[PDB]
Amino acid sequence: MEHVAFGSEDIENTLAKMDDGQLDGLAFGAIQLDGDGNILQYNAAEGDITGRDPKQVIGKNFFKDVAPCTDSPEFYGKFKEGVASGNLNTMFEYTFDYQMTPTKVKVHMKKALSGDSYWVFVKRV
Ligand SMILES: *C(=O)/C=C/c1ccc(O)cc1
């Protein structure tokens, strides 16, 4: 297993070195989005939590296609405020309930070290 703790202060530096295969060794869900919300990376732990097949969601828009329950001021609204500002670091609890059993999770959104990319980390609560 890859040893990185959910919510670590330097998580973006640690994950910058990770290929899709190493991202799959994380103890929590990790999704990398571009500024428009398109999925660039989606790890195995995230698929375990949500039921989505990782390879199938890459390239889809997270807010429009995959996760409509997140299209709200409380999730997507925070993401879009962060992209526009060029800075994002927020953690909050949320319930995923689209085409799945309602599941309570802790979400951490953070701007990646890379230019136009943002991370969404997820763990069960
Ligand atoms: C609500 O529509 C949430 C859906 C969802 C959350 C996280 C995922 O990775 C996939 C779908």
From Swiss-Prot:
GO molecular-function term, one example from the UniProt record: photoreceptor activity
Gene that specifies this protein: pyp
Organism: Halorhodospira halophila
Protein role: Photoactive blue light protein. Probably functions as a photoreceptor for a negative phototaxis response.
NCBIfam families listed in its UniProt record: photo_yellow
Protein name: Photoactive yellow protein
SUPFAM superfamilies: PYP-like sensor domain (PAS domain)
InterPro entries linked: PAS, PAS-like_dom_sf, PAS_fold, PYP
Similarity comment: Belongs to the photoactive yellow protein family.
